[PDB]
Design a binder for this molecule. Structure first.
Ligand SMILES: [Cl-]
Ligand SMILES: [K+]
Length: 118
């Protein structure tokens, strides 16, 4: 695969099920906390989907639109800026990268984060 689509997280209960599945496989997951009005988020999406393909079968990648999902799900991430790309493992957030700049550069910083926990 050259690109893998990020799966949307519906709510806190869905996050719970996602984390139980990741624990079964002893894998981390990636969550892209984003907003649809944020140009940085929009430009990052295709680059994140290319990165997700590089980790197909090893790390599942998810996304959550902070204006559409329930407020209780956004509080699970403790989000304050977008895009916030978090690595979760063993049921909790282990590290995060805050976008804000060129998408390729955010991706290299996310790659460094993945290599620490995978
Ligand atoms: Cl919720
Ligand atoms: K925060």
């Amino acid at each position: 695969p050259t690109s893998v689509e990020m799966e949307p997280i519906d709510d806190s209960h869905h996050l719970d099920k996602i984390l139980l599945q990741a624990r079964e496989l002893s894998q981390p997951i990636i969550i892209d906390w984003m907003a649809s009005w944020c140009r940085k988020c929009i430009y990052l999406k295709p680059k994140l989907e290319k990165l997700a393909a590089e980790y197909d079968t090893k790390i599942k990648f998810y996304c959550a639109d902070v204006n559409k999902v329930p407020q209780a799900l956004v509080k699970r991430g403790n989000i304050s800026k977008m895009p916030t790309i978090q690595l979760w493992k063993d049921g909790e957030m282990k590290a995060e990268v805050i976008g804000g700049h060129k998408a390729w550069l955010v991706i290299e910083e996310v790659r460094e984060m993945i290599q620490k926990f995978v």
